[PDB]
Design a protein around this ligand. Structure first.
Ligand SMILES: Nc1nc2c(ncn2[C@@H]2O[C@H](COP(=O)(O)OP(=O)(O)OP(=O)(O)O)[C@@H](O)[C@H]2O)c(=O)[nH]1
Lengths: 66, 122, 134
């Protein structure tokens, strides 16, 4: 047990290595909206993704492993 | 536009302004609009043309003495505008639908047109 | 297991998910959707199930705010005179099945699934919950 780190430390240790930075900065915060208690219907989810499409491509591809 | 500002399909005779030397443009918004909406510069000819038609259909109060003078004034305006604005107007008429002598209007509607908090579903 | 749902009018039995000596797990339909029900058959009524129910209610309050944590939302001590039942939201797939169900998880999906597991543990620790059966 003394060799096991805390959960937050593993995420920091592998941040940018096993987990690309995109997971923490955008995937986790953006995706969290869809796992919220406030139910987005399948129709609403598509419209939300459509509205954000330009931002998603900018956040995922940049201007350009993307 | 085939549907009006309230989603009703156009009816009756409509005079569309023809833009000279340009192909009809289908992009939205069209670069060669036929019906200049009220948001742009109100063309006195366009406003009066709409009024003359509204009068013809019986949608404006008929005042015999005023009509002779007013329509004569419209004739002067239209004559003056025709001399300076050499623009052509192409008339297009849309079909009307009737059943049991009643006219029906086609309104844009989608075929499928007819819980935010869950206790258990997280 | 399905026989235990006959006494719960808000849950309609759908399918059996597994049977063990400790917990029998079955899927049922509820007004909120699909739910997984683990039924513990009470053989000795002298067992202090109230103490465990209080512990489960504490878990629900502690884990209510975790986005990647799903505590037992309902614990019924005397759901039936024969068994105590635990209720939680049903999720489409368990990780055991998800690995063999198409589309096969790509490297980017595998990294994402691992990342979310760690985030779930981090969140549970900060929320004061330990899993004990990860
Ligand atoms: N697809 C799917 N599988 C589920 C669902 N709920 C449970 N299962 C699976 O059905 C089985 C139920 O047994 P469990 O008691 O949860 O097994 P376990 O996770 O090893 O034991 P615990 O640590 O006590 O939860 C496991 O294989 C679960 O992955 C579900 O909602 N959807």
């Amino acid at each position: 047990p003394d060799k096991r780190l805390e959960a937050e430390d593993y995420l920091k240790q592998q941040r940018g290595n096993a987990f690309p930075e995109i997971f923490y900065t955008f995937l986790q915060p953006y995706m969290a909206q869809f796992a919220k208690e406030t139910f987005l219907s399948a129709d609403e989810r598509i419209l939300v993704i459509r509205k954000d499409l330009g931002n998603i491509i900018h956040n995922l591809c940049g201007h350009d492993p993307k | 536009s085939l549907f009006g500002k309230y989603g009703m399909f156009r009816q009756g005779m409509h005079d569309l302004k023809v833009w000279p030397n340009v192909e009809a443009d289908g992009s939205e918004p069209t670069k060669t609009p036929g019906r200049t909406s009220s948001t742009l510069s109100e063309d006195q000819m366009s406003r009066l043309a709409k009024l003359t038609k509204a009068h013809r259909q019986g949608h404006m109060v008929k005042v015999d003495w005023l009509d002779r003078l007013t329509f004569r004034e419209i004739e002067m305006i239209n004559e003056s505008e025709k001399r300076s604005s050499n623009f052509m107007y192409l008339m297009v008429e849309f079909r009307c639908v009737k059943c049991d002598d009643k006219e029906y209007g086609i309104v844009y509607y989608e075929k499928d047109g007819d819980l935010t908090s869950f206790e258990l579903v997280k | 297991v399905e026989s235990y749902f006959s006494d719960i009018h808000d849950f309609e039995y759908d399918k059996s998910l597994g049977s063990t000596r400790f917990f029998k797990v079955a899927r049922a339909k509820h007004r909120e959707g699909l739910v997984v029900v683990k039924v513990f058959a009470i053989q000795d009524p002298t067992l202090p199930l109230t103490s465990y129910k209080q512990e489960l209610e504490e878990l629900k309050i502690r884990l209510n705010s975790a986005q990647n944590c799903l505590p037992f939302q309902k614990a019924s001590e005397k759901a039936s005179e024969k068994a105590a039942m635990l209720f939680r939201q049903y999720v489409r797939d368990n990780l055991y099945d998800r690995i063999s169900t198409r589309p096969f998880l790509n490297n980017i999906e595998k990294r994402w699934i691992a990342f979310q597991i760690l985030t779930a543990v981090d969140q549970a620790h900060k929320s004061g919950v330990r899993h004990g059966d990860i």
